[PDB]
Amino acid sequence: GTLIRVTPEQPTHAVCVLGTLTQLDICSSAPETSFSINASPGVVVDITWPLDPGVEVTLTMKAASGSTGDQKVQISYYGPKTPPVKALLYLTAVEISLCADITRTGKQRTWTWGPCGQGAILLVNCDRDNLESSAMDCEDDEVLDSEDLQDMSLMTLSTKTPKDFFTNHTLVLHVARSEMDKVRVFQATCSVVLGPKWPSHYLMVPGGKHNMDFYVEALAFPDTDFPGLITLTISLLDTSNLELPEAVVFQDSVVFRVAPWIMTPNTQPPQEVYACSENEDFLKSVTTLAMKAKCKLTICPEEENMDDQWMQDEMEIGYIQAPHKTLPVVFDSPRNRGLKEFPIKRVMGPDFGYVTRGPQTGGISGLDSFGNLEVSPPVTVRGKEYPLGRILFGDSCYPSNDSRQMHQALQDFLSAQQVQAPVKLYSDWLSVGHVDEFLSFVPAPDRKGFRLLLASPRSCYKLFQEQQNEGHGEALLFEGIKKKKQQKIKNILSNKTLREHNSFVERCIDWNRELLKRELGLAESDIIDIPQLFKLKEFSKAEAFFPNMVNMLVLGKHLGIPKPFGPVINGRCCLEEKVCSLLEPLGLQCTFINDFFTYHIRHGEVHCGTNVRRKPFSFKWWNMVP
Amino acid sequence: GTLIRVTPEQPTHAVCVLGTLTQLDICSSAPETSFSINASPGVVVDITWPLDPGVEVTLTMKAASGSTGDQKVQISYYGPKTPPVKALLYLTAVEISLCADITRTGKQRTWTWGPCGQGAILLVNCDRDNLESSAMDCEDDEVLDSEDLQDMSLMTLSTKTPKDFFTNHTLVLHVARSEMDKVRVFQATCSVVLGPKWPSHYLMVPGGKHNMDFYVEALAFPDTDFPGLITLTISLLDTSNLELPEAVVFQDSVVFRVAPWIMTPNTQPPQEVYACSENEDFLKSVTTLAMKAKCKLTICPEEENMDDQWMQDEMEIGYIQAPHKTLPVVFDSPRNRGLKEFPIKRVMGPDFGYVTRGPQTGGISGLDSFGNLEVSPPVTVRGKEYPLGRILFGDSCYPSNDSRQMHQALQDFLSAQQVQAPVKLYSDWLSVGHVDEFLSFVPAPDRKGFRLLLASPRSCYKLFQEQQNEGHGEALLFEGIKKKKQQKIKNILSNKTLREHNSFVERCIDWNRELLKRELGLAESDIIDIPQLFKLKEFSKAEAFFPNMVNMLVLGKHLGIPKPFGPVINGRCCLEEKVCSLLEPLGLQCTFINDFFTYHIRHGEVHCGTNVRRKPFSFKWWNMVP
Ligand SMILES: *CC(=N)NCCC[C@H](NC(=O)c1ccccc1)C(N)=O
Ligand SMILES: *CC(=N)NCCC[C@H](NC(=O)c1ccccc1)C(N)=O
Ligand SMILES: [Ca+2]
Ligand SMILES: [Ca+2]
Ligand SMILES: [Ca+2]
Ligand SMILES: [Ca+2]
Ligand SMILES: [Ca+2]
Ligand SMILES: [Ca+2]
Ligand SMILES: [Ca+2]
Ligand SMILES: [Ca+2]
Ligand SMILES: [Ca+2]
Ligand SMILES: [Ca+2]
């Protein structure tokens, strides 16, 4: 909005940016009734008229000027016996537009969510396209490779002005000081105009028609103290008077939203599998499973591992997504065990981003291991859509001196990525304490296109009771293993303290069942119970009695399930048969992997020993309304 | 939600909290068809029935139990040739309700804004009811006075259980560790159960009917890292098994929203005026003005002042408001000049809260003085209501090496009080740089019930030109003052560099005019221009040429306006006459106060030398939808 005051005493000179509302004040300095308005054909006035202040006169230009004051407005004041008196306005029209991909196609004042929303997207430049640097590309103030610009967002300044216009006007590009530490802007022809050191920059623009390209990268993910928006503004300054200060004539802005970090559920098609190298036959089995599922396979060796076999736990592979660019990004967990370097050294790289949260020298729990970080498949809940699913992570039921939690910095980060609205589940009853110890998700061809699997002592008691009823009470759990105390179905069933333990575990699992039902919108027909016994040991914390079968590797329809070594009835482990009877009808393929004397005995299973990069959702996160 | 699994093998025992959904799993452990359901009259089952898993059985109790298992459910399984087989469920119904003033009358799972919203309110306990302490009451972990509880929010736990119930159950009260540093909870009969040191506490509750009262205070205002919600939860634990861990049976919560700090515009009725004590006749004039406006008057003496006369600038008196309690609260500015102690020592006190932001040892601007902090009267803008008005504060147009801004910590705080959605205006062209240097708001009996006053060189040129046209060109500005270079209207008008300066100032004021028009919804008919000349001096920054009349004390309809000492035409200063002609038709009373050789010459005026506590809005902030 602009109000030009017109004065018969002296002509006025004004600039008019096209797309702006220019109005006239004709009354303030009127002489002494009536006025008339004559203007050159480039000017459209909307409004032989009386000198009433309340009546509005608006001026709109159709085209940029070819020279200063090349459009004219003449206001004629007159009365009953007064010769008409003229006020002169000389206008200069210019085109100043700051453009970005506000419609999110790859090419209002605010950023809005959803399919009818508006607002451009910025990716954090947290990958490493640069040769032999150890840093994410956005840690310096330079575009070091041409490929790096593909991660960046394009913004253009179009101007159309007279050839001499910037003799007396200057354009400045700026960002609030508030936001300068989270963005960097390069000018193309390729060097920094805005960023952490500099919140504004004077542009060198020639008169006429000109187009100037900028590349923009984010430096920070949305977080507790950063909602995720960055506004960049162009200001047009009048520098006509050599004594007087600059005078802002016009401001325009674009508002960017920083891309959130997004996880991928087990129901997204797998692309690449990870584990550690002893476990040679364990590695054989996942190697064939990866082959069957068409996945690239990467392995971390003893040298790099530093003895760390829990490839599930230091990292989580998500992705960031903008209309121009989608890339995988590793969330590196602060647990900083022997795998501490793996995400940094050879998961971070060309088109593979990095991020980490939490204290890095100590201040951590078991529940900060990313076996305690999962996501549901897409779900709709009492009408609210979660088309990227909901992050799931384990916690206690209430905070006590003895309870554990994932570090608040991690929880806060996950929440500030609004788009998979986290749900806290109860996992602290488990010795290790990870949600993957009692749940998994698998694809299914019907209902909602998945099933929630839950560990279930109920199902295993039922299974073993049926076996006994059919005469197999002497059947031995742990047939196979040369150095473990074997146990008969009869004695398993008659052990009253084992049954009490498993009643307590069942309760803990039931509590979460119902939590997932409420928060994820599940009916029982969404859920499969997997026969699974547990035992309490050390602080009354639960570990698995036999290899924890729910803690499986999901590679499409190909499943890597820990071999339980259950009672062999008619030539087969009945646990394996029960699992197969439950999952094969969904068209899933179950391979049972011996993880016993390498994973199981150190309190984890196949899922705990592996990790998977999966295909990002096709649904665009910005088309959600969180 | 709860799913009880029933088993003919063995009876089950369950607790049922009234108001909860209890469902039965009848199929899982059914024998081998059909089942029937018989229950005692206290139990209503909703559901001679087939053994289909998908058919749901729900159980609801109407009354609390008098003893354990005093309600019964019996499930009869049968078939074609099978005698009916019974499963037994023994239920114990209890009443566990956590209550607060969720309807906001003084007495869903989420806090919601607006007149049909829900959610209780918590005040920050940032006043000082305690005798001779220097601290806000919420800095310790004790209720030291009975009056202190009036600032606190009541929350009640009602329970109705069997007399022996808490033999095998325990209740715990908790808050996330995330939120414990921002709340404190006392138990009444009076000591702390929850707070910064403790996130949970085991309640001692007797069986039967019991009611336990808690008092809750907030410790933090909503801010960048605190959206302003605090959830407190009660968990019911089963402690029946002496070996096994506690087992959560039921959780319920109340969600509190912390009251935001709120400012009061000049259109709110005044209650108390502040200034500093030399200025004896300045003090006389405000003393009479306060008297006319029925205001208490408090004065800060030379000893305490430390030479600081700018009582506008260290502090801003707002208020916090809950259904049970409203109190004034002083926002103490970090400028920490000679008035540094005044807000702490004798504005903070009984039913007068305190808050401060920003760095306190150095790191400040002129624009952190609270002459640069104002609010508009209530306004509606293109349909959006701002029923408490919009905070207004001064800034530059873009950040440069030479621009100033209010400290980000202050801006962030003001924004996080969502309820007066701040607007940044342009004040950095002014030497001192405060929005009060160029705007004020006054009550008016018509349109929107106020006018925006703006300083206007345009109006003063017009005024002086008319004077000259009427023959008064020799009239002297500064008639009155014995030691200042007087100046004739003729020479004022003919000074071309003065006119250039005032053209630039006009532009800066016009820019804000239009900003206020957009952001506040104003039409010109909302706005009065006040004749005012400026001059540029020192960095081309604007100061007032004569005492800045817009910088006035608004006490209802009684105005304390700086005496301009303008040209005396027909026995009166024509500036004073012009102002009176503009404001008297609105029914305002103008007193012109000589502030010349005490305020004006040190770059400020009457508003700058004073401060006002005003009446809080009657509209309840929580009934807004920000
Ligand atoms: C399943 C999952 N995500 N698991 C990680 C759990 C195993 C791991 N084990 C050990 O640290 C360990 C050290 C020494 C002896 C035995 C086990 C863990 N607790 O993180
Ligand atoms: C109008 C308003 N809110 N004013 C405060 C402006 C005056 C004050 N003056 C001085 O500090 C000063 C010191 C020494 C000599 C003259 C003036 C200020 N700049 O804060
Ligand atoms: Ca770079
Ligand atoms: Ca890059
Ligand atoms: Ca790490
Ligand atoms: Ca890249
Ligand atoms: Ca994981
Ligand atoms: Ca206290
Ligand atoms: Ca108090
Ligand atoms: Ca202070
Ligand atoms: Ca009080
Ligand atoms: Ca103020």
CA of A295 to the centre of ligand 6 (A): 22
B436 counts as catalytic:
yes
Instruction: Check whether A572 is labelled as a binding-site residue.
Output: no
Q: Is the dihedral of CA B281, B285, B291, B295 positive or negative?
A: negative
Calculate the CA dihedral of residues B435, B438, B441, B442 and round it to 10 degrees.
150
Full DSSP string of A200-237:
EEEE---SEEEEEEEEEEE-S--BTTB-SEEEEEEEEE
Contact list, B400 vs chain A (CB under 8 Å): 200
- Take residue B514 and report the two structure tokens written for it: 């239009």
Q: Catalytic annotation on A608?
A: yes
- A174, A407, A434, A472: the catalytic one is A434
Measured from the alpha carbon of residue B316, the closest ligand is 12
Instruction: Give the number of whichever ligand sits closest to the CA of residue A427.
Output: 1
- Contacts of residue B440, defined as CB under 8 A and 6 or more positions apart, other chains included, come to B266, B452, B453, B550, B551, B552, B554, B607
Q: In this complex, which of A53, A244, A507 lies closest to B500 when CB atoms are compared? A: A244
What is the distance in A from the centroid of ligand 6 to the CA of A337? 28
Closest CA of chain B from A82, distance in Å? 19
| Beta-sheet pairing, B120-122 with B553-555 | unpaired
Judge whether A137 is annotated as a binding position.
yes
Q: Which residue of B has its CA nearest to A410?
A: B178
C-alpha of residue A430 to centroid of ligand 1, in Å: 12
Q: Report residues whose beta carbon is within 6 angstroms of any ligand 2 atom.
A: B 310, 312-313, 369, 371, 432, 434, 436-437, 551, 602-605, 608
- Angle of helix B574-583 relative to helix B457-469, nearest 10 degrees, comes to 120
Tell me which residues have their CB within 5 A of the ion that is ligand 12.
Answer: B 370, 373
Number of neighbouring beta carbons within 10 Å of residue A21: 12
The token duo for A351 is 């088109």
Locate the domains of chain B by residue range: 1-99, 100-258, 259-626
If you take atom 16 of ligand 1, which residue's CA is the nearest one?
A602
Say how far apart CA A31 and CA A314 lie, in whole Å. Answer: 80
Resolution reached, in Å?
A: 2.3
Question: Where would I find the beta strands (DSSP E) of B18-126?
Answer: 22-25, 34-39, 43-46, 49-50, 57-61, 71-79, 82-99, 120-122
Using CB atoms, which residue from B54, B178, B400 is nearest to A200? B400
CATH code at A100-258: 2.60.40.1700
Q: Does domain A259-626 have CATH number 2.60.120.10?
A: no
Q: Which of A244, A470, A522 to mutate to test the interface with B (most CBs of B within 10 A)?
A: A244
Q: Sign (positive/negative) of CA torsion B107, B108, B113, B117?
A: negative
Question: Where does A5-125 have alpha helices with state H?
Answer: none
Highest CATH level, class, for A1-99: mainly beta
Q: Ligand 1 pocket test: which of A335, A434, A603 has the largest number of ligand atoms within 8 Å of its C-beta?
A: A603
Q: What are the strands of the beta sheet with B589-593, ordered from one edge?
A: B553-555, B558-562, B589-593
Q: Could you tell which of B552, B602, B612 is best to mutate to test the pocket of ligand 2, judged by most ligand atoms within 8 Å of the CB?
A: B602
| Residue A352, both tokens | 């593979």
Distance from CA of A176 to the nearest CA of B (A): 7
Query: Phi/psi of residue B574, each to 5°?
Result: -70, -25
B153-161 vs B208-218, strand pairing mode = antiparallel
* Residues B554, A528: Cα–Cα separation, whole Å: 72
Beta carbons of A235 and B426 less than 8 Å apart: no
How is residue B178 written in tokens?
A: 């995330």
Domains B1-99 and B100-258 share a fold: yes
CA B103 to centroid of ligand 7, rounded, Å: 41
Q: Please answer whether residues A221 and A260 qualify as being in contact, where contact means their C-beta atoms are separated by less than 8 angstroms.
A: yes
Distance from CA of B541 to the nearest CA of A (A): 9
Q: Which residues pair with A158 in a beta bridge?
A: A97, A211
Measured between alpha carbons, how far is B573 from B547 in angstroms, rounded to an integer? 13
Instruction: Determine what percent of chain A falls in helix, strand and coil, rounding each to the nearest 5.
Output: 20, 35, 45
Q: State whether A405 and B177 contact (CB < 8 Å).
A: yes
Joined together, the tokens standing for residue A223 give 């977080």
Cβ of B251 within 8 Å of Cβ of A1? The answer is no
Cα(B89)–Cα(B22) distance, integer angstroms: 12
Cβ separation A540–B243 shorter than 8 A: yes
* Residue B206: other Cβ atoms inside 10 A: 12
Cβ-contact B295, B450 below 8 angstroms: no
CA dist list (Å): A479 to A447, A476, A602, B409: 38, 6, 20, 67
Counting every residue, how long is chain B? 626
CA A148 to ligand 4 center in whole angstroms: 4
Contact A78, A42 (CB under 8 A): no
DSSP state of A269: P
Looking at all shown ligands, the one closest to residue B434's CA atom is 2
DSSP sequence for B180-240:
GGGEEEEE---EEEEBTTBSEEEE---SEEEEEEEEEEE-S--BTTB-SEEEEEEEEEE--
Q: How far is CA A350 from CA A135, A346, B54, in A?
A: 12, 10, 51
Which residue shows structure tokens 């009443």?
A: B95
Give the chain A residue whose CA is nearest to the CA of B462: A29
Q: How far is CA B145 from the centre of its chain?
A: 25
Handedness of CA B283, B289, B291, B295 (dihedral sign): negative
Q: Which residues contact B159 (CB under 8 A, 6 or more apart)?
A: B94, B95, B96, B97, B171, B205, B209, B210, B211, B212
Check the annotation: does A142 bind a ligand: yes
CA A194 – ligand 4 centroid, Å: 18
Contact flag A536-B172 (C-beta cutoff 8 Å): no
A412 is catalytic: no
**Nearest CB to A514; choose among B3, B172, B247:** B3
Tell which atom from ligand 1 comes closest to the C-alpha of A434: 3
From CA A512, how far away is CA B309, in angstroms rounded? 64
Following CA atoms A61, A62, A67, A73 in sequence, which dihedral angle do they give, to the nearest 10 degrees?
Answer: -30
**Chain B contacts of A462, Cβ < 8 Å?**
28-29
Locate the DSSP E strands across A153-302.
153-161, 169-175, 183-187, 191-194, 200-203, 208-218, 229-238, 247-258, 270-276, 296-300
Helix (H, G, I), strand (E, B) or coil at B343: helix
- By most ligand atoms within 8 Å of CB, the mutation choice from B310, B440, B596, B610 for ligand 2 is B310
| Integer Cα distance of B575 and B64 in angstroms | 79
The answer to whether residue A436 is catalytic is: yes
Q: Which of A109, A172, A397, A502 to mutate to test the interface with B (most CBs of B within 10 A)?
A: A397
Burial of A381 (0-12, 13-18, 19+ CB in 10 A): middle
**What span, in angstroms and rounded, lies between the C-alpha atoms of A482 and A193?**
69
A200 a known binding residue?
A: no
In the DSSP assignment, the letter for residue A142 is B
